[PDB]
Structures are given as structure tokens and as C-alpha cells.
């Protein structure tokens, strides 16, 4: 499956290099630039628990998911992961709970200690 590939071939983009966020590029984006902290970012995404029938696709080619990068508007894994993406890039992330919802989780949506899988398209990014 897609998680499997990321495990085996994903690059660990954490700082602590603890394999807490593994990334694969599925489609290469355009030019070289990627977003700075405080850039407003526009993405499509979908996600699932790795071992779970929770799935999320609210922003799956419907409306863009927008947030401001590294302001903590999202889980650490996204502040980390999306920061690395070019405009037009699509990527898979596999995410240990420590870079997501941790032992607390986010009941009932996310259980305690969840690993998450996301497929993210970076549509665009703008200076705050
Ligand atoms: C900095 O730490 C956090 C920041 C934000 C939160 C809330 C969860 C936070 O969720 C996320 O960080 C991740 C990555 C971005 C996509 C949404 N995320 C999710 O995990 C997904 C999510 C989770 C949701 O509830 C947890 C959620 O509820 C509204 C949601 O709505 C669309 C989507 C998932 C649900 C089930 C999965 Cl399985 S994955 C969040 C949810 C919705 C929007 C959002 O930002 C944009 C906006 O508000 O419009 C931020 C928890 C945080 O810590 C746990």
C-alpha cells in the first residue's frame, strides 16, 4: 500500500531524525521555491489512520485547505512536511503520533497514539 512505500522509501524530514514524519514525492512540483514560516499555504489533501477506517478528504479537490505555515495552525507533521513542498507537488506523509495527536489523540476522530497517512497537494503559497 501507499504507507508501505513511504516506510521503505520515504525520507525522514524530522530534525530529531526519529522517522516521525516520512515523506515520498508522488508528483514533482514546479520551480525550486517552497514556503517560509508565516506564508499562507493552499492545499488539497486526504488522510487516514494507518490501521484504521477513519478517513478524511474534506479538502479533496473540493475547497482548498488554507493555513499559515509554522504558526501551529496544524499538527507539527504538517508544519514540517508542507514546508518542504514545491507548488504543484503532491506527496505522501507517514506520521508517528508524536508529530500528530500523541497519546491524547483527538477523540472520537483520532485515537490515542495514532499513526497517520496523508496525501497532500500544495496548490499555492503567499507571503503573510
Ligand atoms: C498545532 O497543533 C494543532 C493544530 C490544530 C489542531 C486541530 C486539528 C488540525 O488537524 C490537522 O492538523 C491535520 C492536518 C491538516 C488537515 C487536518 N488534519 C487532520 O488530522 C484531519 C482532521 C482532523 C480533525 O479533527 C482532529 C478535523 O476536525 C475539524 C478535520 O476537519 C477537516 C480534519 C484528520 C481527521 C482524521 C484523520 Cl485520519 S486526519 C486541524 C484541523 C482542521 C483545520 C486546521 O487548520 C485550518 C483551519 O483551522 O481552517 C487544523 C490540533 C493540533 O494539535 C493536535
Those residues with Cβ within 8 angstroms of residue 15's Cβ, 6 or more apart along the chain or in another chain? none
Rounded-to-integer distance, Cα 102 and Cα 18, Å: 15
Quote the number of domains for the chain. Answer: 1
Ligand 1 interacting residues, C-beta cut-off 6 A: 45, 47-49, 54, 56, 58, 65, 67, 72-75, 78, 101, 106, 109-110, 116
Domain containing 66 equals: 1-128
94 exposure class (CB count in 10 Å sphere: 0-12, 13-18, 19+): buried
Kindly compute the dihedral angle of the four CA atoms of residues 61, 84, 86, 47, in this order, to the nearest 10 degrees: -10
- 109 C-alpha to center of ligand 1: Å? 10
The structure was resolved experimentally with: X-ray
Those residues with Cβ within 8 angstroms of residue 108's Cβ, 6 or more apart along the chain or in another chain? none
Closest C-alpha among 37, 20, 50 to residue 84? 37
Amino acid at each position: 500500500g501507499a504507507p508501505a512505500t513511504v516506510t521503505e522509501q520515504g525520507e525522514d524530514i524530522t530534525s530529531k531524525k526519529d522517522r516521525g514524519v516520512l515523506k515520498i514525492v508522488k508528483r514533482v512540483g514546479n520551480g525550486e521555491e517552497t514556503p517560509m514560516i508565516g506564508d499562507k499555504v493552499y492545499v488539497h489533501y486526504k488522510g487516514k489512520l494507518s490501521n484504521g477506517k477513519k478517513f478524511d478528504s474534506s479538502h479533496d479537490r473540493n475547497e482548498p485547505f488554507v493555513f499559515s505555515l509554522g504558526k501551529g495552525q496544524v499538527i507539527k507533521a504538517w508544519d514540517i512536511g508542507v514546508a518542504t513542498m514545491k507548488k504543484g507537488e503532491i506527496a505522501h506523509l507517514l506520521i508517528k503520533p508524536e508529530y500528530a495527536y500523541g497519546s491524547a489523540g483527538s477523540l472520537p476522530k483520532i485515537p490515542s497514539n495514532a499513526t497517520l497517512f496523508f496525501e497532500i497537494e500544495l496548490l499555492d503559497f503567499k507571503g503573510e
